[PDB]
Amino acid sequence: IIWGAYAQRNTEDHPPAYAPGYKTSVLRSPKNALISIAETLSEVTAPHFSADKFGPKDNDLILNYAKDGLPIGERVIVHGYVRDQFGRPVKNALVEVWQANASGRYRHPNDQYIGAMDPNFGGCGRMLTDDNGYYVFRTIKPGPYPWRNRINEWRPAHIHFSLIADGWAQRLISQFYFEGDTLIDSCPILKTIPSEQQRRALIALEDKSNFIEADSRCYRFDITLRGRRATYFENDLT
Amino acid sequence: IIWGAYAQRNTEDHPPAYAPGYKTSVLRSPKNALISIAETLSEVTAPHFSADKFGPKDNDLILNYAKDGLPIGERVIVHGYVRDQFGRPVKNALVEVWQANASGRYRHPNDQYIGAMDPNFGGCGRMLTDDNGYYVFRTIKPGPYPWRNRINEWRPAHIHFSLIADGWAQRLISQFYFEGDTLIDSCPILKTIPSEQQRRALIALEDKSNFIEADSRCYRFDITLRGRRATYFENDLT
Amino acid sequence: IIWGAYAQRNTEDHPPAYAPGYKTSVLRSPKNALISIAETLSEVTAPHFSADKFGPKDNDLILNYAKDGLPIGERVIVHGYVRDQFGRPVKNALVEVWQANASGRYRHPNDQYIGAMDPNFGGCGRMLTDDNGYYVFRTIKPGPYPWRNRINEWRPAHIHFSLIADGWAQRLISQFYFEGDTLIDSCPILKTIPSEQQRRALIALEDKSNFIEADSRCYRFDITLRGRRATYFENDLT
Amino acid sequence: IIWGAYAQRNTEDHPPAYAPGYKTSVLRSPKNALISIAETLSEVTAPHFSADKFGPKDNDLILNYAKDGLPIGERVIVHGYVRDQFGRPVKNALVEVWQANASGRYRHPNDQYIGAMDPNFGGCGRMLTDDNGYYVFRTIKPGPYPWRNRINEWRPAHIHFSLIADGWAQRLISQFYFEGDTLIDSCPILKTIPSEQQRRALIALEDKSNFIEADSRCYRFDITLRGRRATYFENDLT
Amino acid sequence: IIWGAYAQRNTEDHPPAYAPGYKTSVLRSPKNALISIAETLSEVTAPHFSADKFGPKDNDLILNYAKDGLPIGERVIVHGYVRDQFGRPVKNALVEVWQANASGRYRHPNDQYIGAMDPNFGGCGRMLTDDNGYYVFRTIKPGPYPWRNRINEWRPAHIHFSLIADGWAQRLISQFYFEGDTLIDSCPILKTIPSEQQRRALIALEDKSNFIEADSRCYRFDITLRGRRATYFENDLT
Amino acid sequence: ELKETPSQTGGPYVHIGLLPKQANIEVFEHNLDNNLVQDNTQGQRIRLEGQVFDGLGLPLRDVLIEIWQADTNGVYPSQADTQGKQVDPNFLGWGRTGADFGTGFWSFNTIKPGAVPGRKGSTQAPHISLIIFARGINIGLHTRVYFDDEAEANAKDPVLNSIEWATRRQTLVAKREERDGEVVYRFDIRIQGENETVFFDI
Amino acid sequence: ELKETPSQTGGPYVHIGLLPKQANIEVFEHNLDNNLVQDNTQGQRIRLEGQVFDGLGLPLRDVLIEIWQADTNGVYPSQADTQGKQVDPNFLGWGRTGADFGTGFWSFNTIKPGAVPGRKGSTQAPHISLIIFARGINIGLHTRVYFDDEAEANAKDPVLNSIEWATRRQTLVAKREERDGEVVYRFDIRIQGENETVFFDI
Amino acid sequence: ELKETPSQTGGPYVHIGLLPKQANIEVFEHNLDNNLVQDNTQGQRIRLEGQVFDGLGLPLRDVLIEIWQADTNGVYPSQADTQGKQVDPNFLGWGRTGADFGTGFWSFNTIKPGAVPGRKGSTQAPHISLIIFARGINIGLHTRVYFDDEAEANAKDPVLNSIEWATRRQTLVAKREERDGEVVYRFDIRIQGENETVFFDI
Amino acid sequence: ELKETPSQTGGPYVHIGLLPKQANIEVFEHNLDNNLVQDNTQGQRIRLEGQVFDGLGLPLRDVLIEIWQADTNGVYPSQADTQGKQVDPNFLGWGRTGADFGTGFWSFNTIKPGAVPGRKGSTQAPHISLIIFARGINIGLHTRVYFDDEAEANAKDPVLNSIEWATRRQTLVAKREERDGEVVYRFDIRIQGENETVFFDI
Ligand SMILES: [Fe+3]
Ligand SMILES: [Fe+3]
Ligand SMILES: [Fe+3]
Ligand SMILES: [Fe+3]
Known part of the structure; x- marks a missing residue:
């Protein structure tokens, strides 16, 4: 198989750059339209990360920062699959996540929220997807986060995730939420996304059969990245 | 992959132990609730049966008991797949079936039904599922069976089946019926099952494309067993 | 009848000037709102074109540029009526059209599309509507056109048309498409139009009864222009 | 796996032999009913074609006949999968296609249509499906074809295809159309097919994600052939 | 305006030639399909009938045969318009009608129905449409007619009509019925027509506002004939 | 529409x-x-x-027949005729008759038509357009009558040559006879079976 | 499914x-x-x-014809052949041709096939599977060609005997001829009417 | 409607x-x-x-421009002109041009228009109606060209005075120049940003 | 899909x-x-x-930046690189950093990339692919960094020449400096307003 370029990103399935409802986007959004280009080797290539460099607890947010005891909060496992738009699994992709603790408090110098800090929780982890595009990490369910967009704004509970896969054109950063959270319907950030079906694509579903008795609950969340088209005639990539 | 315990049996997808409509269950059902336990090696292990011990006609109820001639009745083939709840195929599982003959008469000392006995039909067979969880046997379609629950009770045509797979927790015995049988809607035994969707899970479907011309008809019936969860963190099984 | 001014153009039935989805409009759209004015003789008058100046093949795109042979493509006839919003026919209006060839290739210096050029096709014609506002021309159905808005953008097959009628306020340029073209639902340019009913107003309908056997197919497309109101009291136009 | 015979062709999913609406079928349709037979080695076997004999441009109708330049018309790629009715892929099946050019003109001595001939287009190609039953060819989208059934009859744009696979019983010749073509609803030939769902099975779908920027559009079209049943008991084939 | 050929007759809007339900059609219907031809002067021309030859009572079936008194039956007026499929009125077309009397008895040697003959009723008339395609005649409403298709067959009340207009291709003979007649839903002859909308096109509607007090009732019935297409390019008719 | x-x-x-x-x-x-x-x-x-x-x-x-034809010079007495030639002022060009209730025979007393212009500058052989109406016939059947003594013209006729099944062309040719001094063309129409007359959708 | x-x-x-x-x-x-x-x-x-x-x-x-047959020993050059015998390495077993635009004649240069095993241990008489494709034909028509010089084998053929209308069996038997030294089997196919060729749904 | x-x-x-x-x-x-x-x-x-x-x-x-104007006496060569005066018989009053593919410059050779009657008995200053069409422009943009040497007339012009943002009025005034003996009015149009040209919805 | x-x-x-x-x-x-x-x-x-x-x-x-680039020979340390050349075994080609919380400055210590093959046999000027992530930015912004000392290569670069607004091309060129003996390219990114950096949809 001789691969061609990645399929065109469908701008309609993503939030626009300018979204007045999400205030900080007003000054941090280009006024000019993005210039689309035909892909070259630069856009279809991406770095490789060896698993040798990852620690044993890198995907365990419950223990990778635990000092004196366990973090306070809801023990939950999150897993799922990473595929490209054509359904092909994405192997060995770097998945990085970060979140606030159970109080909705981030371990970051710029966070002054009254929510209590957890000395045993860090809030960040990472993993590589396997040959089936499968990924899995453990964590404490994050609490909603109050922030200043409009004075009384509240982010629904959420986990930040980033992916670096096979092509630079696939570079993606986003956030996923938990099924049933009532704050999902009023979040200005989630509302930057035009369609309803795309908003639901960011919701992790309760996976009851995979709950671990007297231990942890579990959420299922699949991620879809752009996919490459195969070439059967001219190969103009190079 | 390090396997954990089998997912919890969903009591709601099964008949309760006490079902007044099915009379004999009144005295043969515990009054106390079942005590749920965390699984150990005992519950996740099961015996292995070598195919060497099975005869060539073990899965052919039309010929495994034929003496002077062929059994009287509807020549039908029944096949399908055995999977665990997570969709994984169940390999080399022991499947045992037994049924009445075309008259709705069982070859059993305790059966005095006026329905005629067939000297060339036994009513029992067995098989092992293959690597894809596929199974297949041949038989004579069983006739409905009159029995005494309420004086004029009639079991719809049915075949009894039993499975012994990879884990003791999977041990299952049940019965399947044939699509279209009008007796299905009034059977007290089938009605012990709470939901309608679960009742339909016991109906073998007509598989017309797999009919064998001038020979046999065919029914498709898939069986679903409990499945094990994978473990990615602590392994408390042992 | 003493004519007054043309009815106000309904800005809601037209695309706005600023349409981010259609990239080049970002820098070529006024930031200030249009200033509406009461009409004067300047806005209600327009030039007159004598048919004496038009050639016999001006409305025949199949033959007006044919040199050695006929153009390659789908022989189609397009006709319809030009009316003002009040249903009155628009007589002797200048209709000018231009399009790409069957390959979706325009005969224009700035077009480098790989689509093949047709030495016998020019792609432009013109006509004057008759006393009933009726117009008719012949052409080769244009093929879809790939262009760079987003890298893989494709214009559905279309024909460009321009009208100069009785009043300058009526000056209109637009494009019409062909019924059934699946590219119609994803075109960013066609989507600049707010309502769905207005988008459909640009679709030429298959006119099967007017097909010419073993020769040409036919499409029906009516155009509606702004219309003047009659005055029965004060005449402030002058 | 010991294969048996192919499943019975479902006469209801195909046009009858006698179809008055399609005039030439009146004298070229048997008056007697077809005589069904049990299959033998003759019906389940078929020839094998080595790829060694195929040229590099056999599946490229844009270039396999190009002499001085490129053909005039819509550059389109057509791909899809060939499966048997049971979903199994059909490997190394010979696929042969032929069509008219962009003018709806066939390169055939008996075609006198006024539509212009393209000196650089032949209108025929062939391929072998791969191990996944996948096939792919390039071509110019054919223009509708006027013909004499009723005097003003018009075939919607279409491509003729033929398949020779694993069994003679699978021998199939047909035609596929393009999504959105309005001529599809009035074609007497397409109407010879009884059901609506079967008519839609001959429509190639627009595959926008597989469009190649500034180059070609793409259609997806899957073909389903008859499939063989497996045998687990008597093998009467021979 | 340079006229071309008449639009193709839509065979789907007419009864087929072979209609088993209408018995006599079995032996009087060609087995071969009709051969469609491109029209010539022969098909687009037709005879002209001067009104000078028509008598004053030719369109009055109540009086044109009255000898000693008036016919027995329901005095009804029938009028309507004759247009071509494009809505143009058909001027000076010859309209000829004939029907049975109020007893459902025809004044024809071959009619032996027990229904009583009316010495003052003939059952035939004729007219020419005016410049607006308007026609009008007076008559006695015909009674249903028993006939032998199946032994107890009954024609709903009906009037036979024939038209000879501007082109031979327009030659048409048919029958119209009266709104509300319950026999309409079971007539084998009316059922030879495929669609329901076409069957309703033969029903004369009650025109209450045009009833003439203490005199006659009135029915409205419009007739549509094939229409010619205009030619704007080549004129191959001759 | x-x-x-x-x-x-x-x-x-x-x-x-x-x-x-x-x-x-x-x-x-x-x-x-x-x-x-x-x-x-x-x-x-x-x-x-x-x-x-x-x-x-x-x-x-019980069949009813009508014919439509041009005059001796191939001009139709119709305002739709675009030949620009003057038609015979004493010719309706149309006639109607019915088969005899007893024998089934029908007949018309007319004139042999002149050649009429065909499409694209071609010339049609002399012919009479005929239509059939009757019980059992749902739609009037169209056909044409050509004459056997016009073999040369028929061989070049566009309509006759548009019939790909050549053997059927003869069903449209009437046979000339001469009862004494009168010219008679016999034209038998067969709706079904062998030698079935060709019928047109015009 | x-x-x-x-x-x-x-x-x-x-x-x-x-x-x-x-x-x-x-x-x-x-x-x-x-x-x-x-x-x-x-x-x-x-x-x-x-x-x-x-x-x-x-x-x-305008008809197109294809044939499928076994080699001289009754073995099909197909991986689906289960006879376990080695097939002729120089035989495709398949061919295609078209009737002549002018005369309508078609022909194939091939080999006379050997007897092929039938169902349930029976033996089929030598035959060639043939299919017809053409305008007016909605689905390819299947039929078989048997040879008249194999009368004994044909009499015992399972397919031919599965046709209850015995008089139709002959429509599937080609006639042997000998243009000089070459063997020629004439096989005319009649889609409709009398002596209509038997067609199979395989 | x-x-x-x-x-x-x-x-x-x-x-x-x-x-x-x-x-x-x-x-x-x-x-x-x-x-x-x-x-x-x-x-x-x-x-x-x-x-x-x-x-x-x-x-x-890639912009295309058209202008519409009255003759030297303020009369439009249009049947819609109701002034009752005879218009210049040798003046179409309309013209079209395109910017140069390389430089972007456009130009028209015309006549300076005479004053045209305004609404309610007012008098408009001399002007030319102009429209802009081009890629990126969804609807043709309307504007007017006035002349700087008609300061007195412009000051009383109804349309110019209907623009409440006075500083924008100047964007509609072209500057007179004289390349040798020819009179040239320079009119630059700015679709966006500062000094954005006033556009009308007429 | x-x-x-x-x-x-x-x-x-x-x-x-x-x-x-x-x-x-x-x-x-x-x-x-x-x-x-x-x-x-x-x-x-x-x-x-x-x-x-x-x-x-x-x-x-609070902005976070990442870069992706080829080695000194224009080969990407990616299995997707189809050049067939051996890449520098000691180069990840990727890096990430964050602006300073106080000053806003960011920086990377890397190598100047070699020319990489463009589409259709063209050659791209040396460049580094860069992406921007931050609060207020809904989708990571893509852009490229070219070097001012590669004027000849930049003039022929396919991507830079695909930008029709020529004046914007310069926003993608970093300026070379030399703090003592170290080579430093200054690249300031402007998301909005004048001199707004060109951003790509790749
Ligand atoms: Fe957050
Ligand atoms: Fe265009
Ligand atoms: Fe075709
Ligand atoms: Fe009647």
Whole structure:
């Protein structure tokens, strides 16, 4: 198989750059339209990360920062699959996540929220997807986060995730939420996304059969990245 | 992959132990609730049966008991797949079936039904599922069976089946019926099952494309067993 | 009848000037709102074109540029009526059209599309509507056109048309498409139009009864222009 | 796996032999009913074609006949999968296609249509499906074809295809159309097919994600052939 | 305006030639399909009938045969318009009608129905449409007619009509019925027509506002004939 | 756009309205008939006769026939004729008749038509357009009558050559005869079976 | 379970895609033809020829034909053949041709097939599977060609005996002839009417 | 009541249909151009030139422009003109041109228009109605060109005074120049940003 | 076919998960950083630094940046590179950093990339692909960094020439400087307003 370029990103399935409802986007959004280009080797290539460099607890947010005891909060496992738009699994992709603790408090110098800090929780982890595009990490369910967009704004509970896969054109950063959270319907950030079906694509579903008795609950969340088209005639990539 | 315990049996997808409509269950059902336990090696292990011990006609109820001639009745083939709840195929599982003959008469000392006995039909067979969880046997379609629950009770045509797979927790015995049988809607035994969707899970479907011309008809019936969860963190099984 | 001014153009039935989805409009759209004015003789008058100046093949795109042979493509006839919003026919209006060839290739210096050029096709014609506002021309159905808005953008097959009628306020340029073209639902340019009913107003309908056997197919497309109101009291136009 | 015979062709999913609406079928349709037979080695076997004999441009109708330049018309790629009715892929099946050019003109001595001939287009190609039953060819989208059934009859744009696979019983010749073509609803030939769902099975779908920027559009079209049943008991084939 | 050929007759809007339900059609219907031809002067021309030859009572079936008194039956007026499929009125077309009397008895040697003959009723008339395609005649409403298709067959009340207009291709003979007649839903002859909308096109509607007090009732019935297409390019008719 | 009014059979009593006199009904002073030749009609007189047979080889005794033709110079007495030539002022070009209730024979007294222009500058062989109406016939059947003594013209006729099944072309050619001094062309129409007459959708 | 893709006529120009050279199109270097005999092909050479007639007794001048057969020993050059015998390494067993645009004649140069095993241990008489494609034909018509010089084998053939209307069996038997030293089997196919060829749904 | 057909951009190749010669297409004998002055046209000749700039201050090299104006006496060569005065018989009053593909400059050779009557008995200052079409422009942009040497008339112009933002009025005034003996009015149009040209909805 | 997972802003605390140490979180032994040069990395060392400014001309003090580039020979350390050349075994080609919370400055220590093959046999000028993530930014912004000392190569670069607004091309060219003996390219990114940096949809 001789691969061609990645399929065109469908701008309609993503939030626009300018979204007045999400205030900080007003000054941090280009006024000019993005210039689309035909892909070259630069856009279809991406770095490789060896698993040798990852620690044993890198995907365990419950223990990778635990000092004196366990973090306070809801023990939950999150897993799922990473595929490209054509359904092909994405192997060995770097998945990085970060979140606030159970109080909705981030371990970051710029966070002054009254929510209590957890000395045993860090809030960040990472993993590589396997040959089936499968990924899995453990964590404490994050609490909603109050922030200043409009004075009384509240982010629904959420986990930040980033992916670096096979092509630079696939570079993606986003956030996923938990099924049933009532704050999902009023979040200005989630509302930057035009369609309803795309908003639901960011919701992790309760996976009851995979709950671990007297231990942890579990959420299922699949991620879809752009996919490459195969070439059967001219190969103009190079 | 390090396997954990089998997912919890969903009591709601099964008949309760006490079902007044099915009379004999009144005295043969515990009054106390079942005590749920965390699984150990005992519950996740099961015996292995070598195919060497099975005869060539073990899965052919039309010929495994034929003496002077062929059994009287509807020549039908029944096949399908055995999977665990997570969709994984169940390999080399022991499947045992037994049924009445075309008259709705069982070859059993305790059966005095006026329905005629067939000297060339036994009513029992067995098989092992293959690597894809596929199974297949041949038989004579069983006739409905009159029995005494309420004086004029009639079991719809049915075949009894039993499975012994990879884990003791999977041990299952049940019965399947044939699509279209009008007796299905009034059977007290089938009605012990709470939901309608679960009742339909016991109906073998007509598989017309797999009919064998001038020979046999065919029914498709898939069986679903409990499945094990994978473990990615602590392994408390042992 | 003493004519007054043309009815106000309904800005809601037209695309706005600023349409981010259609990239080049970002820098070529006024930031200030249009200033509406009461009409004067300047806005209600327009030039007159004598048919004496038009050639016999001006409305025949199949033959007006044919040199050695006929153009390659789908022989189609397009006709319809030009009316003002009040249903009155628009007589002797200048209709000018231009399009790409069957390959979706325009005969224009700035077009480098790989689509093949047709030495016998020019792609432009013109006509004057008759006393009933009726117009008719012949052409080769244009093929879809790939262009760079987003890298893989494709214009559905279309024909460009321009009208100069009785009043300058009526000056209109637009494009019409062909019924059934699946590219119609994803075109960013066609989507600049707010309502769905207005988008459909640009679709030429298959006119099967007017097909010419073993020769040409036919499409029906009516155009509606702004219309003047009659005055029965004060005449402030002058 | 010991294969048996192919499943019975479902006469209801195909046009009858006698179809008055399609005039030439009146004298070229048997008056007697077809005589069904049990299959033998003759019906389940078929020839094998080595790829060694195929040229590099056999599946490229844009270039396999190009002499001085490129053909005039819509550059389109057509791909899809060939499966048997049971979903199994059909490997190394010979696929042969032929069509008219962009003018709806066939390169055939008996075609006198006024539509212009393209000196650089032949209108025929062939391929072998791969191990996944996948096939792919390039071509110019054919223009509708006027013909004499009723005097003003018009075939919607279409491509003729033929398949020779694993069994003679699978021998199939047909035609596929393009999504959105309005001529599809009035074609007497397409109407010879009884059901609506079967008519839609001959429509190639627009595959926008597989469009190649500034180059070609793409259609997806899957073909389903008859499939063989497996045998687990008597093998009467021979 | 340079006229071309008449639009193709839509065979789907007419009864087929072979209609088993209408018995006599079995032996009087060609087995071969009709051969469609491109029209010539022969098909687009037709005879002209001067009104000078028509008598004053030719369109009055109540009086044109009255000898000693008036016919027995329901005095009804029938009028309507004759247009071509494009809505143009058909001027000076010859309209000829004939029907049975109020007893459902025809004044024809071959009619032996027990229904009583009316010495003052003939059952035939004729007219020419005016410049607006308007026609009008007076008559006695015909009674249903028993006939032998199946032994107890009954024609709903009906009037036979024939038209000879501007082109031979327009030659048409048919029958119209009266709104509300319950026999309409079971007539084998009316059922030879495929669609329901076409069957309703033969029903004369009650025109209450045009009833003439203490005199006659009135029915409205419009007739549509094939229409010619205009030619704007080549004129191959001759 | 409107759909054409659906056709229906003329029925067994079609004579009442189209040929009153044959049904013994005298209501009209001027009755349309099967005689197209007037006193000053130009051209050679001819008689067109024959029968119409069903699928059993039996004649229809209730069929009604009409013909439409050009004058001796190939000009139709119709405002739709675009030839620019003056047509015979004493020729209607149309006629109607009915088979005999007893024998099934029909006939017309007319003139042999002149060659009429075909499409794209071609020339059609002399012919008469004919239509059949009757019980059992849902839509009037169209056909043409050519003459066997015009072999050269027929061989070049566009319509006859548009029939790909060559053996059927002969079903449209009437045979010339001469009862004494009168010219008679026999044209038998066969709706079904062998030698089935070619019918057109015009 | 999926439904089989619906069939459609091959159309009048079926030659473009299946027999390019006959349509005067040279695009392929290797063109599939009606010659199944190679240099080292075993068995006695034979020529299969004939015509295909419509309901009017007229030959189809646009029909396309294909045949599928076993080698001289009754073994099909197909991986689906389960006989366990080695097939002739120089035999494709398949061929395609088209009737002549002018005369309607078609022909194949092949080998007379050996007896092939039937169902339930029976033996089939030598035969060639043939299929017809053409304008007017909605689904390819299947039939078989048996040989008249194999009377004894034909009398015991399972397929021929599965046809209860005995008089129709003969329509499947080709007649042997000998143009000089070459063996020729004439096989005429009649789609409609009398002596209509038997067609199978396989 | 019907809705007006929705507008769409003229597109980058608008020249094909409106200015064929600029796209190197010779199909018409009579080509509409940017020259409104004929041999016997009355009034003082003037040249109107300039450029159209986008939001980046860059000229549009694919814009098409048209102008509509009255004759030297303020009478439009239109049947819609109700002044009752005779218009210049040698003046179309309309012209079309396209920016240069390389430089972006456009120009028209015309006549300076006479004052035209305004609404309610007012008098408009001399002006030319101009419209802009181009890729990126969804609906043709309307504007007017006034002349700086008509300061007194402009000060009393109804349209210019209907613009409440006084500082914008100047964007509609072209500057007079004199290349030798020819009068030239420079009129630059700015679609976006500072000094954005006033656009009207007429 | 599935739709791509919708993008969301990285948020103000993006450092927690992508640059833990900058957020004072020590959880990983191996931390990804902004240093692409290793001991045996080939090519001339260079420092890429600058700031990112918002629509007010103020630097973003919470922006995160990543770069992707080829080695000194124009080969990407990616299995997707099809050049067939051996890449520098001691080069990841990727790096990540964050603006300083106080000043807004960011920087990377890397190597100047070699020319990489363009589409259709063209050659791209040396460049580094860069992406911007931050609060207020809904989708990562893509752009490229070219070098001013490669004027000849830039003039022929396909991507730079695909930008029709020529004046914007310069926003993608970093300026070379030399703090003592070290080579430094300054690249300031402006998200909005004048001199707005060109952003690509790749
Ligand atoms: Fe009647
Ligand atoms: Fe075709
Ligand atoms: Fe365009
Ligand atoms: Fe957050």
